[PDB]
Amino acid sequence: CSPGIWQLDCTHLEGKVILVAVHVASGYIEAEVIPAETGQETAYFLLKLAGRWPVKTIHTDNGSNFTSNAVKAACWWAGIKQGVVESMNKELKKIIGQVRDQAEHLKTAVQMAVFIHNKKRKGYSAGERIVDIIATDIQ
Amino acid sequence: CSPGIWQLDCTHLEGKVILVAVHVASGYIEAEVIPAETGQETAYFLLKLAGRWPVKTIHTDNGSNFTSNAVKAACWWAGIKQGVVESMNKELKKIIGQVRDQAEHLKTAVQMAVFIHNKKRKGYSAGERIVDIIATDIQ
Numbered sequence: 001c002s003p004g005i006w007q008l009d010c011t012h013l014e015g016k017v018i019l020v021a022v023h024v025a026s027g028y029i030e031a032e033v034i035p036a037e038t039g040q041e042t043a044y045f046l047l048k049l050a051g052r053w054p055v056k057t058i059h060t061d062n063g064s065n066f067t068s069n070a071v072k073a074a075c076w077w078a079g080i081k082q083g084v085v086e087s088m089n090k091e092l093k094k095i096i097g098q099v100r101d102q103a104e105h106l107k108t109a110v111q112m113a114v115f116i117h118n119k120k121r122k123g124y125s126a127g128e129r130i131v132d133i134i135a136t137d138i139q
Numbered sequence: 140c141s142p143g144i145w146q147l148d149c150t151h152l153e154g155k156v157i158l159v160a161v162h163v164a165s166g167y168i169e170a171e172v173i174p175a176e177t178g179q180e181t182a183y184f185l186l187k188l189a190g191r192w193p194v195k196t197i198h199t200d201n202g203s204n205f206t207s208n209a210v211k212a213a214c215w216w217a218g219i220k221q222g223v224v225e226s227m228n229k230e231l232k233k234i235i236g237q238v239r240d241q242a243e244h245l246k247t248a249v250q251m252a253v254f255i256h257n258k259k260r261k262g263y264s265a266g267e268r269i270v271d272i273i274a275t276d277i278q
């Protein structure tokens with residue numbers, strides 16, 4: 001897929017919200033545990049994401065997620081416009097379950113699962129693929 | 140410099156704490172506004188960082204930052220061992236000052252400054268250099 005496309009969705013676990021961003025072309029994930037599912041939290045997440053990777057386009061399974069003025073302002077400022085994703089989210093949810101008792105806080109288990117997911121060789125890992133896709137696109 | 144070396148330090152602004160991670164070889168920055176300067180916050184930041192980039196070694200200007208059991212546990216689990224940095228932190232502090240009135244929250248201004256810093260061409264940007272350094276190291 002195009003190297004600037006990311007998918008963002010929230011999932012719920014233990015009464016908390018996990019914002020999951022998938023780089024569609026590599027399967028690479030960025031995730032954070034947010035206090036609430038709000039436009040301000042999504043906007044802040046998008047600003048962080050766009051400063052770290054070249055974010056061109058964002059996709060989601062819940063269109064209404066992107067209607068706040070806060071989200072529209074983040075996309076405006078950062079210059080963002082509006083199978084794999086289902087699979088990557090499924091893998092992450094499974095990994096969180098597998099490491100959950102190794103940590104007190106869900107947020108810690110989430111970051112351990114992101115780490116495991118991005119480094120797992122499938123033969124390259126999602127972390128290796130994103131860096132290869134973005135470097136070759138710059139070239 | 141070696142591609143797995145990162146420098147982590149905290150700086151203070153408006154009574155808040157900004158954790159700044161610099162990828163020494165590229166000048167690329169990752170930053171977060173943390174509620175307090177604690178071992179638990181540093182450990183959590185390191186886990187997130189290590190799941191996104193291949194973190195081999197961490198440097199700091201304040202050695203005591205890395206003594207908590209929480210930090211030692213994050214480095215153990217993620218397999219981490221213990222001019223440019225001064226310049227990158229200086230540039231970020233200047234950029235935050237330059238964009239500060241464009242946002243209500245300091246954390247928003249911080250992420251705008253990270254974005255500006257990583258995308259600025261110096262001729263490649265810090266964001267372009269990190270992806271090139273890591274991709275060629277995998278190759």
Ligand SMILES: Cc1nc2c(ccn2Cc2ccc(F)c(F)c2)c(-c2ccc3c(c2C)CCCO3)c1[C@H](OC(C)(C)C)C(=O)O
Nearest residue numbers: 040041043044047069070073074077241242243244247251
């Ligand atoms: C806190 C916050 N609110 C925002 C927005 C945007 C709309 N609103 C709603 C609103 C409503 C009434 C107002 F009087 C008012 F001033 C803003 C940004 C925001 C979001 C993204 C963003 C920018 C802004 C200002 C500036 C350029 C980079 O991208 C904010 C913002 O905070 C979050 C990122 C946490 C949402 C902020 O700190 O100002």
Ligand SMILES: Cc1nc2c(ccn2Cc2ccc(F)c(F)c2)c(-c2ccc3c(c2C)CCCO3)c1[C@H](OC(C)(C)C)C(=O)O
Nearest residue numbers: 102103104105108112179180182183186208209212213216
């Ligand atoms: C909350 C937290 N505390 C930690 C630690 C480690 C030591 N301590 C102190 C402590 C003291 C007394 C205990 F009875 C006790 F159980 C742990 C991790 C932590 C930090 C990093 C880390 C791991 C753990 C458990 C597991 C493998 C991946 O890396 C935590 C941890 O929370 C933060 C990351 C926010 C610090 C957690 O959720 O358990």
